[PDB]
Symmetry: C2
Subunit: 291 residues, 2 copies
């Protein structure tokens, strides 16, 4: 089976290494220089002290009939990808973008492809055009979008390396919002307060502010069980209690953030339902300023 | 004449030194000898809309006279050393013109023989150099007695002033100070985080709503007499300064210590003493402090 990975960023290279253990992989990239380099060297994965190399093809456009295309580009790059995908024969496409900003776009992208969405819980850092460091051993979880048939991806993902496990979930909306609610409540606050996830629980005022944010976002996302979801946010917080969140990390290092993909999404949905999002908008304004 | 020491050689200190020098013997007590030397050298220059005046003034790096009045204009962070000097001199009149109300907690439990006065500065003033200040905003100083100080003590001192340096007595120190604090507390922290000019608080629906939430906390902590009127004022002053970047926004952009402790930190201490919640104030404080 042929798999195409669209995007040669950290996530795209990580996916390329692990999936090439089972399948014929091609990295589809926007830079001829990256394509050539992968074509010559394959992909290098680092994990702990150890280095491994996977043979992988590359190309700057889609020139094969891929059984699956995995989209790993950032929101800046998504519209150009839709256009490319419109020019190919019906196949399976899995979008792995962080946040839910792209979902408005997906809802009204009407094509004949079978669409799947997923979340990447791994940590990865790109080192060069051909090299990636697997810094956090996580998982990928995926679901069918718009009634696509899950069994189209089951054979592809049946067997994986124990460090690349892949889990299916039936409800894509629950899947994406379960992750989004957590990131929305934690990431902005730790970025502005510059504290570990754990101090959000241990400072009564910070916990109370996170609850205000939660109550706004939970309403916007129309989550099924408010109290259970709030338990989960606090529980995910206690489990990651020593972590400087990803956005806090982006912040000390002056990298642009997932503010658009995470909070921007809540703002657009709040506007459409005529919902109030005072705390979310303040956080959005404050993080956009730091960028 | 009478002797006045101005503690602090920032914008307000130089402005007060210029105008009080017209009637009295002034010394500016500056922390840097180079400023003290430079004032003692070409005097103080004040710029006021096309005119430039010069006043001769003394200067020093320590309080080593018995002044008839001391006027304290330094940032809160240096206030601690000031207090320490204020113990080794003879009892006198001290007028605190500090921004914020963090000094009010220090003064509350201050055992001294000093007569304590407290006031606000409504002038616009911008320090141009070690010796020069631009009087950009023709305002006033307003002052009150703190605790049991006798107001009449400042009668002769403030009997005569330049038309552009008026000074007004107000009977209620707490109303005077809180009335300026409610405004600073609502505008400054918010602008510092959002990095927008003041007017952007009024014209962005969510930002205005967030300001209101901050106002409601601060208003309750301070126990402000007329709440509806104070809220109008906050929005009013926002309107008057629409194109301005607040002083706290400026401090944050510049990597300088802010007046968070004197503005917000005081409200936090007060919320705590009353078992009141101040969740928005606390988040603002933590975020501004994180930047320092």
């Amino acid at each position: 089976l042929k798999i195409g990975i669209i995007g040669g960023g950290s996530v795209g290279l990580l996916c390329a290494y692990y999936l090439s253990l089972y399948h014929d992989v091609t990295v589809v990239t926007r830079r001829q220089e990256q394509a050539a380099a992968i074509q010559s060297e394959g992909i290098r994965l680092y994990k702990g002290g150890e280095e491994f190399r996977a043979d992988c093809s590359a190309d700057t456009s889609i020139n094969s009939d891929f059984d699956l295309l995995v989209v790993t580009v950032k929101q800046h790059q998504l519209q150009s990808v839709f256009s490319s995908l419109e020019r190919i024969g019906k196949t399976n496409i899995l979008f792995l973008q962080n946040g839910m900003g792209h979902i408005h776009d997906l809802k009204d992208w009407h094509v004949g492809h079978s669409i799947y969405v997923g979340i990447v819980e791994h940590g990865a850092v790109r080192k060069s055009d051909t090299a990636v460091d697997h810094t956090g051993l996580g998982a990928i979880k995926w679901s069918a979008f718009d009634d696509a048939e899950p069994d189209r991806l089951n054979i592809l993902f049946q067997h994986n390396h124990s460090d690349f496990p892949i889990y299916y979930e039936t409800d894509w909306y629950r899947l994406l919002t379960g992750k989004l609610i957590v990131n929305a409540c934690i990431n902005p606050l730790t970025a502005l307060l510059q504290v570990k996830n754990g101090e959000l629980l241990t400072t009564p005022a910070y916990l109370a502010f996170m609850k205000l944010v939660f109550q706004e976002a939970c309403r916007i996302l129309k989550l099924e069980n408010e109290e259970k979801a709030w338990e989960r946010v606090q529980a995910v917080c206690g489990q990651t209690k020593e972590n400087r969140s990803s956005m806090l990390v982006d912040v000390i290092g002056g990298r642009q953030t997932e503010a658009d993909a995470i909070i921007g999404y809540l703002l657009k949905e709040a506007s459409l339902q005529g919902l109030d999002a005072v705390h979310l908008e303040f956080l959005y304004g404050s993080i956009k300023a730091l960028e």
